[PDB]
Design an enzyme around this catalytic site. Structure first.
Site, PDB file in Angstrom:
ATOM      1  N   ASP A  61       0.815  -1.208   0.000  1.00 30.24           N
ATOM      2  CA  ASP A  61       0.000   0.000   0.000  1.00 30.24           C
ATOM      3  C   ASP A  61       0.848   1.256   0.000  1.00 30.24           C
ATOM      4  N   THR A 100      -7.112   3.390  -1.800  1.00 35.98           N
ATOM      5  CA  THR A 100      -6.878   1.946  -1.660  1.00 35.98           C
ATOM      6  C   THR A 100      -7.955   1.003  -2.223  1.00 35.98           C
ATOM      7  N   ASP A 152       2.115   2.582   3.217  1.00 39.44           N
ATOM      8  CA  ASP A 152       1.098   3.642   3.329  1.00 39.44           C
ATOM      9  C   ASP A 152       0.940   4.227   4.766  1.00 39.44           C
ATOM     10  N   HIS A 208       1.887   8.173   5.758  1.00 38.69           N
ATOM     11  CA  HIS A 208       0.915   9.144   6.257  1.00 38.69           C
ATOM     12  C   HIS A 208       1.448   9.921   7.449  1.00 38.69           C
ATOM     13  N   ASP A 264      -0.987  -0.329  -4.901  1.00 36.76           N
ATOM     14  CA  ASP A 264      -2.330   0.203  -5.185  1.00 36.76           C
ATOM     15  C   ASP A 264      -2.331   1.685  -5.644  1.00 36.76           C
ATOM     16  N   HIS A 265      -1.324   2.459  -5.203  1.00 39.80           N
ATOM     17  CA  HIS A 265      -1.164   3.909  -5.469  1.00 39.80           C
ATOM     18  C   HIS A 265       0.128   4.425  -4.845  1.00 39.80           C
ATOM     19  N   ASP A 322     -24.918  10.950 -22.104  1.00 38.80           N
ATOM     20  CA  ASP A 322     -25.079  10.127 -20.921  1.00 38.80           C
ATOM     21  C   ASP A 322     -23.768   9.914 -20.147  1.00 38.80           C
ATOM     22  N   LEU A 348     -19.169   5.922 -23.679  1.00 35.78           N
ATOM     23  CA  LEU A 348     -19.486   5.210 -24.908  1.00 35.78           C
ATOM     24  C   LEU A 348     -20.306   6.054 -25.858  1.00 35.78           C
ATOM     25  N   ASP A 388     -22.794   7.613 -28.195  1.00 38.39           N
ATOM     26  CA  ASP A 388     -24.246   7.694 -28.099  1.00 38.39           C
ATOM     27  C   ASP A 388     -24.900   7.361 -29.430  1.00 38.39           C
TER      28      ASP A 388
HETATM   29  C1  LIG Z   1     -15.800  -1.055 -19.132  1.00 40.08           C
HETATM   30  O1  LIG Z   1     -16.181  -2.388 -19.285  1.00 40.08           O
HETATM   31  C2  LIG Z   1     -17.429  -2.664 -18.725  1.00 40.08           C
HETATM   32  C3  LIG Z   1     -17.675  -4.173 -18.784  1.00 40.08           C
HETATM   33  O2  LIG Z   1     -17.773  -4.619 -20.117  1.00 40.08           O
HETATM   34  C4  LIG Z   1     -18.489  -1.887 -19.487  1.00 40.08           C
HETATM   35  O3  LIG Z   1     -19.711  -1.969 -18.814  1.00 40.08           O
HETATM   36  C5  LIG Z   1     -20.641  -2.796 -19.475  1.00 40.08           C
HETATM   37  O4  LIG Z   1     -21.170  -2.115 -20.578  1.00 40.08           O
HETATM   38  C6  LIG Z   1     -22.219  -2.798 -21.229  1.00 40.08           C
HETATM   39  C7  LIG Z   1     -22.690  -1.916 -22.389  1.00 40.08           C
HETATM   40  O5  LIG Z   1     -23.383  -0.785 -21.897  1.00 40.08           O
HETATM   41  C8  LIG Z   1     -23.351  -3.073 -20.241  1.00 40.08           C
HETATM   42  O6  LIG Z   1     -24.268  -3.876 -20.925  1.00 40.08           O
HETATM   43  C9  LIG Z   1     -25.609  -3.867 -20.386  1.00 40.08           C
HETATM   44  O7  LIG Z   1     -25.797  -4.941 -19.462  1.00 40.08           O
HETATM   45  C10 LIG Z   1     -27.111  -5.222 -19.006  1.00 40.08           C
HETATM   46  C11 LIG Z   1     -27.052  -6.407 -18.037  1.00 40.08           C
HETATM   47  O8  LIG Z   1     -25.889  -6.281 -17.220  1.00 40.08           O
HETATM   48  C12 LIG Z   1     -26.111  -6.337 -15.777  1.00 40.08           C
HETATM   49  O9  LIG Z   1     -25.756  -7.569 -15.180  1.00 40.08           O
HETATM   50  C13 LIG Z   1     -24.398  -7.984 -15.343  1.00 40.08           C
HETATM   51  C14 LIG Z   1     -24.251  -9.332 -14.591  1.00 40.08           C
HETATM   52  O10 LIG Z   1     -23.395 -10.327 -15.138  1.00 40.08           O
HETATM   53  C15 LIG Z   1     -23.383  -6.918 -14.862  1.00 40.08           C
HETATM   54  O11 LIG Z   1     -22.206  -7.066 -15.630  1.00 40.08           O
HETATM   55  C16 LIG Z   1     -23.830  -5.433 -14.896  1.00 40.08           C
HETATM   56  O12 LIG Z   1     -23.246  -4.753 -13.763  1.00 40.08           O
HETATM   57  C17 LIG Z   1     -23.500  -3.316 -13.622  1.00 40.08           C
HETATM   58  O13 LIG Z   1     -24.712  -3.036 -12.949  1.00 40.08           O
HETATM   59  C18 LIG Z   1     -24.766  -3.263 -11.536  1.00 40.08           C
HETATM   60  C19 LIG Z   1     -26.047  -2.575 -11.034  1.00 40.08           C
HETATM   61  O14 LIG Z   1     -27.137  -2.724 -11.940  1.00 40.08           O
HETATM   62  C20 LIG Z   1     -23.521  -2.817 -10.715  1.00 40.08           C
HETATM   63  O15 LIG Z   1     -23.392  -3.492  -9.475  1.00 40.08           O
HETATM   64  C21 LIG Z   1     -22.208  -3.038 -11.453  1.00 40.08           C
HETATM   65  O16 LIG Z   1     -21.165  -2.380 -10.745  1.00 40.08           O
HETATM   66  C22 LIG Z   1     -22.391  -2.528 -12.883  1.00 40.08           C
HETATM   67  O17 LIG Z   1     -22.743  -1.147 -12.749  1.00 40.08           O
HETATM   68  C23 LIG Z   1     -22.099  -0.272 -13.701  1.00 40.08           C
HETATM   69  O18 LIG Z   1     -22.666  -0.381 -14.989  1.00 40.08           O
HETATM   70  C24 LIG Z   1     -24.045  -0.047 -15.055  1.00 40.08           C
HETATM   71  C25 LIG Z   1     -24.496  -0.291 -16.495  1.00 40.08           C
HETATM   72  O19 LIG Z   1     -24.871  -1.647 -16.609  1.00 40.08           O
HETATM   73  C26 LIG Z   1     -24.329   1.402 -14.612  1.00 40.08           C
HETATM   74  O20 LIG Z   1     -25.673   1.533 -14.205  1.00 40.08           O
HETATM   75  C27 LIG Z   1     -23.476   1.926 -13.463  1.00 40.08           C
HETATM   76  O21 LIG Z   1     -23.267   3.294 -13.760  1.00 40.08           O
HETATM   77  C28 LIG Z   1     -22.144   1.198 -13.251  1.00 40.08           C
HETATM   78  O22 LIG Z   1     -21.144   1.896 -13.955  1.00 40.08           O
HETATM   79  C29 LIG Z   1     -25.359  -5.272 -14.968  1.00 40.08           C
HETATM   80  O23 LIG Z   1     -25.852  -5.378 -13.654  1.00 40.08           O
HETATM   81  C30 LIG Z   1     -28.028  -5.435 -20.222  1.00 40.08           C
HETATM   82  O24 LIG Z   1     -29.354  -5.621 -19.783  1.00 40.08           O
HETATM   83  C31 LIG Z   1     -27.964  -4.231 -21.189  1.00 40.08           C
HETATM   84  O25 LIG Z   1     -28.688  -4.439 -22.388  1.00 40.08           O
HETATM   85  C32 LIG Z   1     -26.531  -3.968 -21.600  1.00 40.08           C
HETATM   86  O26 LIG Z   1     -26.133  -5.040 -22.428  1.00 40.08           O
HETATM   87  C33 LIG Z   1     -22.845  -3.810 -19.010  1.00 40.08           C
HETATM   88  O27 LIG Z   1     -23.844  -3.867 -18.019  1.00 40.08           O
HETATM   89  C34 LIG Z   1     -21.679  -3.051 -18.411  1.00 40.08           C
HETATM   90  N1  LIG Z   1     -21.064  -3.807 -17.325  1.00 40.08           N
HETATM   91  C35 LIG Z   1     -20.317  -3.243 -16.355  1.00 40.08           C
HETATM   92  C36 LIG Z   1     -19.777  -4.202 -15.345  1.00 40.08           C
HETATM   93  O28 LIG Z   1     -20.059  -2.031 -16.261  1.00 40.08           O
HETATM   94  C37 LIG Z   1     -18.188  -0.417 -19.460  1.00 40.08           C
HETATM   95  O29 LIG Z   1     -19.140   0.219 -20.295  1.00 40.08           O
HETATM   96  C38 LIG Z   1     -16.780  -0.227 -19.943  1.00 40.08           C
HETATM   97  N2  LIG Z   1     -16.470   1.181 -19.924  1.00 40.08           N
HETATM   98  C39 LIG Z   1     -15.672   1.727 -20.834  1.00 40.08           C
HETATM   99  C40 LIG Z   1     -15.415   3.201 -20.752  1.00 40.08           C
HETATM  100  O30 LIG Z   1     -15.132   1.079 -21.731  1.00 40.08           O
HETATM  101  C1  LIG Z   2      -8.486  -3.132   1.409  1.00 42.05           C
HETATM  102  C2  LIG Z   2      -8.484  -4.460   2.146  1.00 42.05           C
HETATM  103  C3  LIG Z   2      -9.835  -5.132   1.897  1.00 42.05           C
HETATM  104  N1  LIG Z   2     -10.709  -5.312   2.886  1.00 42.05           N
HETATM  105  C4  LIG Z   2     -11.762  -5.936   2.354  1.00 42.05           C
HETATM  106  C5  LIG Z   2     -12.903  -6.350   2.888  1.00 42.05           C
HETATM  107  C6  LIG Z   2     -13.871  -6.990   2.111  1.00 42.05           C
HETATM  108  C7  LIG Z   2     -13.674  -7.225   0.751  1.00 42.05           C
HETATM  109  C8  LIG Z   2     -14.704  -7.866  -0.005  1.00 42.05           C
HETATM  110  C9  LIG Z   2     -14.909  -9.362   0.405  1.00 42.05           C
HETATM  111  C10 LIG Z   2     -15.933 -10.100  -0.559  1.00 42.05           C
HETATM  112  N2  LIG Z   2     -15.601  -9.729  -1.959  1.00 42.05           N
HETATM  113  S1  LIG Z   2     -16.511 -10.594  -3.220  1.00 42.05           S
HETATM  114  O1  LIG Z   2     -17.337 -11.689  -2.543  1.00 42.05           O
HETATM  115  O2  LIG Z   2     -15.543 -11.245  -4.192  1.00 42.05           O
HETATM  116  C11 LIG Z   2     -17.583  -9.470  -4.196  1.00 42.05           C
HETATM  117  C12 LIG Z   2     -18.315 -10.380  -5.164  1.00 42.05           C
HETATM  118  C13 LIG Z   2     -19.090  -9.444  -6.092  1.00 42.05           C
HETATM  119  N3  LIG Z   2     -19.710 -10.235  -7.184  1.00 42.05           N
HETATM  120  C14 LIG Z   2     -20.716 -11.033  -6.470  1.00 42.05           C
HETATM  121  C15 LIG Z   2     -20.241  -9.179  -8.053  1.00 42.05           C
HETATM  122  C16 LIG Z   2     -15.652  -8.290  -2.191  1.00 42.05           C
HETATM  123  C17 LIG Z   2     -14.408  -7.886  -1.522  1.00 42.05           C
HETATM  124  C18 LIG Z   2     -12.459  -6.772   0.217  1.00 42.05           C
HETATM  125  N4  LIG Z   2     -11.542  -6.142   1.058  1.00 42.05           N
HETATM  126  C19 LIG Z   2     -10.335  -5.667   0.758  1.00 42.05           C
HETATM  127  N5  LIG Z   2      -9.886  -5.693  -0.504  1.00 42.05           N
HETATM  128  C20 LIG Z   2     -10.534  -4.784  -1.454  1.00 42.05           C
HETATM  129  C21 LIG Z   2      -8.821  -6.390  -0.901  1.00 42.05           C
HETATM  130  N6  LIG Z   2      -8.360  -6.526  -2.153  1.00 42.05           N
HETATM  131  C22 LIG Z   2      -7.257  -7.293  -2.195  1.00 42.05           C
HETATM  132  C23 LIG Z   2      -6.573  -7.565  -3.305  1.00 42.05           C
HETATM  133  C24 LIG Z   2      -7.105  -7.248  -4.550  1.00 42.05           C
HETATM  134  C25 LIG Z   2      -6.380  -7.518  -5.709  1.00 42.05           C
HETATM  135  C26 LIG Z   2      -5.100  -8.078  -5.629  1.00 42.05           C
HETATM  136  F1  LIG Z   2      -4.404  -8.329  -6.740  1.00 42.05           F
HETATM  137  C27 LIG Z   2      -4.545  -8.377  -4.387  1.00 42.05           C
HETATM  138  C28 LIG Z   2      -5.282  -8.118  -3.234  1.00 42.05           C
HETATM  139  C29 LIG Z   2      -6.865  -7.731  -1.000  1.00 42.05           C
HETATM  140  S2  LIG Z   2      -7.908  -7.150   0.052  1.00 42.05           S
HETATM  141 ZN   LIG Z   3      -3.786   2.205  -0.284  1.00 42.72          ZN
HETATM  142 ZN   LIG Z   4     -22.615   7.623 -24.237  1.00 36.95          ZN
HETATM  143 ZN   LIG Z   5      -3.487   5.652   2.568  1.00 40.01          ZN
END
Ligand SMILES: *[C@@H]1O[C@H](CO)[C@@H](O[C@@H]2O[C@H](CO)[C@@H](O[C@@H]3O[C@H](CO[C@H]4O[C@H](CO)[C@@H](O)[C@H](O[C@H]5O[C@H](CO)[C@@H](O)[C@H](O)[C@@H]5O[C@H]5O[C@H](CO)[C@@H](O)[C@H](O)[C@@H]5O)[C@@H]4O)[C@@H](O)[C@H](O)[C@@H]3O)[C@H](O)[C@H]2NC(C)=O)[C@H](O)[C@H]1NC(C)=O
Ligand SMILES: CCc1nc2ccc(C3CCN(S(=O)(=O)CCCN(C)C)CC3)cn2c1N(C)c1nc(-c2ccc(F)cc2)cs1
Ligand SMILES: [Zn+2]
Ligand SMILES: [Zn+2]
Ligand SMILES: [Zn+2]
Ligand SMILES: [Cl-]
Ligand SMILES: [Cl-]
Ligand SMILES: [K+]
Ligand code: NI
Ligand code: NI
Ligand code: NI
Ligand code: NI
Ligand code: NI
Ligand code: NI
Ligand code: NI
Ligand SMILES: [Zn+2]
EC number: 3.1.4.39
Length: 759
Positions: A109, A147, A249, A253, A296-297, A641, A645, A647
């Site tokens: 970190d 982080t 990290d 700090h 991470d940063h 939007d 991507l 439009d």
């Molecule tokens: C970076 O790459 C990502 C991944 O490819 C791109 O994001 C994808 O873009 C496509 C095209 O717009 C979207 O397609 C739509 O998908 C839905 C169904 O998808 C839903 O379920 C899947 C489950 O497997 C999941 O991948 C999606 O997850 C999003 O939504 C959740 C909440 O609803 C959220 O928890 C998650 O973090 C993610 O949210 C983000 O994206 C949504 C847009 O979906 C947005 O509201 C929010 O602002 C967040 O940024 C989703 O649940 C179909 O029904 C549609 O028709 C359409 O096909 C993908 O959904 C989308 N996936 C992700 C993970 O972002 C980015 O566009 C790309 N960005 C760039 C700049 O390249």
């Molecule tokens: C910052 C420390 C930390 N603390 C927590 C606590 C909870 C969590 C959570 C636990 C559960 N997961 S999950 O079940 O996979 C989410 C599933 C979602 N899907 C169902 C859509 C969420 C992550 C992450 N933490 C993390 N994190 C962020 C970590 N990332 C890495 C990590 C990352 C990359 C490396 F290449 C090395 C290490 C070590 S720890």
């Molecule tokens: Zn950090």
């Molecule tokens: Zn757009």
């Molecule tokens: Zn820090």
């Protein structure tokens, strides 16, 4: 029940148990043994056995796999891994029963990039990975440089806007909940979007070691547990492991990045690495595991006397809530707030002084390269703070001397990457890249199909000895049209008063990757792809050598019905126009008459002309001198939007008064020349140099505080801020650049991901 023989199995006895769970009653008795320390001393080398000790210095411990990491070194005489010279690893010397090489991710970190230059005998194990492995000068985190968003980016290949973890602290208005670093809420899976590496792997049949450790588990034990897991039965043994460390990290700090007290932490961190590397050596796996050392940063000098305070710009600060720190995210404290005025707030923060140390922005107006808008969990008003500074509400908010979270292109925020082992290259030095890219890489090491991500698969093959993935250039979805002379000057009622491809299009025509209709339009000094749907060019290629009015004429290759007209811009008080190929760079007076064609025109606000005119009449030429000619490709962008991507037309919310001429949100330019500058751009025969930007299309210049002065004092500064990757423009235009070159397609992918930072 009990953990009789289940310490950290993959009544609970696993990693997350000492964190809001209840663990089995004997779990400290058995699993967190810490007696007589971690490193073997000569004192114990005979030592009969003992269940109470941390590890074992016996002459039977090897068979158990419960030795201290330094057993074979102290007692049996061998050397530390760090002192041994380095051979090439031409292929994996893995033990029988190993399906592939394991991957061990080592996350640190706040390990600022520059630290690598500090440390001779401060970091001798890490220096040895660095020099024997594949390394880059630095690695670029995502924004915010905090982080949680980065480790999850690193896990997922996704930008924060997409994986949802948009900061250490955040508020989702739909769950109506608050996410924090401290607390149990973050363990709810609803916050965590996308597909992380450990779920991707398991879904494809590759076992994973659990990435998170409870806080109460020491580092030395996290290591030992890893080395124990490696010795499990084949069927149960994971292929991917990870180690996260809070240092350097924490110290950073307290004492700041460049303090005197930071050496010690960096020593402690080399030690833990040494233990890992003598541990691998012991089990006979140091020529078999793939090791990634990544941060991470970075970390910057930040003191609380350099804190700007909202209360100096706003009269009623108690009505709003600030996520303070190295960025600001502003919103209403209460959901019933009548006197809440986002416009007034952004007004009262905008250039109240010359040297103000933060700048406000509606989230959809930040530079596109940050990809920080498009998630309901990102507040609309957002503060971008200057390096070395902080933001806070009232004075009521010295202990800390370092901090991070700034714009991810600032130097102190850059972090580290080293890959060492069979699949990684040997003593090789790859150029800097972004952390979003590594999910793909780790996927490749394990032979996994990556989930869709924001990493460009193939952009980082130059790190690997052995590549599963051969990247295939996307097929084109709209064939262009090449209209001849098809209409007569008299058909047009617009109201307007008045050896090409070989020189001006150097890398082949951009490919349109969506269904539309367009025409290629040649001219002497330039060429263009003209959209018949959007009524202006999608792109415009031209080339300028090193040594290089209100008339608008109609273009007889394009129907009047698919053309703009002057009478709209005449009728829109706020809108004017400009050209994508500038008249000022015309090879001849005769040729100049093409520049005024209606097919070359685009909508521009007067505040924007100031910028655009300056870019075309001054900068392109300046670059041309500097870089030995350049090839420019400018064009327009519609992202109403703000999802990053391209439009569809139904997304566009602005047209020129009464017309169907869509107003772009941004205008792009990609500027290319030969890397080896002593060759001129048009006759290049080797690697390319690219730079590019995505200028926001705004009706005012409130973002540039010095816009009262002449263009040469502020325009380039704006442009540097809106620098971009070619790939970033590809998403926003659905086009595809750089298709006919002498270069391999993996290398064009690396050029497509490059970003000129301007450090
Ligand atoms: C970076 O790459 C990502 C991944 O490819 C791109 O994001 C994808 O873009 C496509 C095209 O717009 C979207 O397609 C739509 O998908 C839905 C169904 O998808 C839903 O379920 C899947 C489950 O497997 C999941 O991948 C999606 O997850 C999003 O939504 C959740 C909440 O609803 C959220 O928890 C998650 O973090 C993610 O949210 C983000 O994206 C949504 C847009 O979906 C947005 O509201 C929010 O602002 C967040 O940024 C989703 O649940 C179909 O029904 C549609 O028709 C359409 O096909 C993908 O959904 C989308 N996936 C992700 C993970 O972002 C980015 O566009 C790309 N960005 C760039 C700049 O390249
Ligand atoms: C910052 C420390 C930390 N603390 C927590 C606590 C909870 C969590 C959570 C636990 C559960 N997961 S999950 O079940 O996979 C989410 C599933 C979602 N899907 C169902 C859509 C969420 C992550 C992450 N933490 C993390 N994190 C962020 C970590 N990332 C890495 C990590 C990352 C990359 C490396 F290449 C090395 C290490 C070590 S720890
Ligand atoms: Zn950090
Ligand atoms: Zn757009
Ligand atoms: Zn820090
Ligand atoms: Cl969401
Ligand atoms: Cl090699
Ligand atoms: K009109
Ligand atoms: Ni270097
Ligand atoms: Ni208010
Ligand atoms: Ni006309
Ligand atoms: Ni004007
Ligand atoms: Ni000018
Ligand atoms: Ni040239
Ligand atoms: Ni190249
Ligand atoms: Zn919050």
């Amino acid at each position: 029940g009990s953990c009789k023989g289940r310490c950290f199995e993959l009544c609970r006895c696993d990693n997350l148990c000492k964190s809001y769970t209840s663990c089995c009653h004997d779990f400290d008795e058995l699993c967190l043994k810490t007696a007589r320390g971690w490193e073997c001393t000569k004192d114990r080398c005979g030592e009969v056995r003992n269940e109470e000790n941390a590890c074992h210095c016996s002459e039977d411990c090897l068979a158990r796999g419960d030795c201290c990491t330094n057993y074979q070194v102290v007692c049996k005489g061998e050397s530390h891994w760090v002192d041994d010279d380095c051979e090439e690893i031409k292929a994996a010397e893995c033990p029988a029963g190993f399906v592939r090489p394991p991957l061990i991710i080592f996350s640190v970190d706040g390990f600022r990039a520059s630290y690598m230059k500090k440390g001779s005998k401060v970091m001798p194990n890490i220096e040895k990975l660095r020099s024997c492995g594949t390394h880059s000068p630095y690695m670029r985190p995502v924004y915010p440089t905090k982080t949680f968003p980065n480790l999850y980016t690193l896990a997922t290949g996704l930008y924060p806007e997409s994986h949802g973890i948009v900061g250490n602290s955040m508020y989702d208005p739909v769950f109506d909940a608050t996410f924090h670093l401290r607390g149990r809420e973050k363990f709810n899976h609803r916050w965590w979007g996308g597909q992380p590496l450990w779920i991707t792997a398991t879904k494809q049949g590759v076992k994973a070691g659990t990435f998170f450790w409870s806080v109460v588990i020491p580092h030395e034990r996290r290591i030992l547990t890893i080395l124990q897991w490696l010795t499990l039965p084949d069927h149960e043994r994971p292929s991917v492991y990870a180690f996260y460390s809070e240092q350097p990290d924490f110290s950073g700090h307290k004492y700041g990045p460049f303090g005197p007290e930071m050496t010690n932490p960096l020593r402690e961190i080399d030690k833990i690495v040494g233990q890992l590397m003598d541990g691998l050596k012991q089990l006979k796996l140091h020529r078999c595991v793939n090791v990634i050392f990544v941060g991470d940063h970075g970390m910057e000098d930040v003191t609380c006397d350099r804190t700007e305070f909202l209360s100096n710009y706003l009269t009623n600060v108690d009505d709003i809530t600030l996520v303070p720190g190295t960025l600001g995210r502003i919103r209403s404290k209460f959901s019933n707030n009548a006197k809440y005025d986002p416009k007034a707030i952004i007004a009262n923060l905008t250039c109240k002084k010359p040297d103000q140390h933060f700048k406000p922005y509606l989230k959809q107006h930040l530079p596109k390269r940050l990809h920080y808008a498009n998630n309901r969990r990102i507040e609309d008003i957002h503060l971008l703070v200057e390096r070395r500074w902080h933001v806070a509400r009232k004075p009521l908010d010295c202990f800390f001397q370092g901090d991070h979270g700034f714009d991810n292109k600032v130097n102190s925020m850059q972090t580290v990457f080293v890959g060492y082992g069979p699949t990684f290259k040997y003593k090789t030095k790859v150029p800097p890249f972004e952390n979003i890219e590594l999910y793909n890489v780790m996927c490749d090491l394990l032979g996994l199909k990556p989930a869709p991500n924001n990493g460009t698969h193939g952009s980082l093959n130059h790190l690997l000895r052995t590549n599963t993935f051969r990247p295939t250039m996307p097929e084109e979805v709209t064939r262009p049209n090449y209209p001849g002379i098809m209409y007569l000057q008299s058909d047009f009622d617009l109201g307007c008063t008045c050896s090409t491809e070989e020189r001006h299009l150097l890398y082949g025509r951009p490919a349109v990757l969506y269904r539309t209709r367009y025409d290629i339009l040649y001219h002497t000094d330039f060429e263009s792809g003209y959209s018949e749907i959007f009524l202006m060019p999608l792109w415009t290629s031209y080339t300028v050598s090193k040594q290089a009015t209100s008339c608008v004429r109609p273009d007889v290759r394009v129907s009047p019905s698919f053309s703009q007209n002057c009478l709209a811009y005449k009728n829109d008080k706020q809108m004017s126009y400009g050209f994508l190929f500038p008249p000022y760079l015309s090879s001849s007076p005769e040729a100049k008459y093409d520049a005024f064609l209606v097919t070359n025109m685009v909508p521009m606000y007067p505040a924007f002309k100031r910028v655009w005119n300056y870019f075309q009449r001054v900068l392109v030429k300046k670059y041309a001198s500097e870089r030995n000619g350049v090839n420019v490709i400018s064009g327009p962008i519609f992202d109403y939007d703000y999802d990053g991507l391209h439009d569809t037309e139904d997304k566009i919310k602005q047209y020129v008064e009464g017309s169907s001429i869509p107003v772009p949100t941004h205008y792009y330019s990609i500027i290319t020349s030969c890397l080896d500058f002593t060759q001129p751009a048009d006759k290049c025969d080797g690697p390319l140099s690219v730079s590019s930007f995505i200028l926001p299309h705004r009706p005012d210049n409130e973002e540039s505080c010095n816009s009262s002065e002449d263009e040469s004092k502020w325009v380039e500064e704006l442009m540097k801020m809106h620098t971009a990757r070619v790939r970033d423009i590809e998403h926003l235009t659905s086009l595809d650049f750089f298709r006919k070159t002498s270069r391999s397609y993996p290398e064009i992918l690396t050029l497509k991901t490059y970003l000129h930072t301007y450090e």
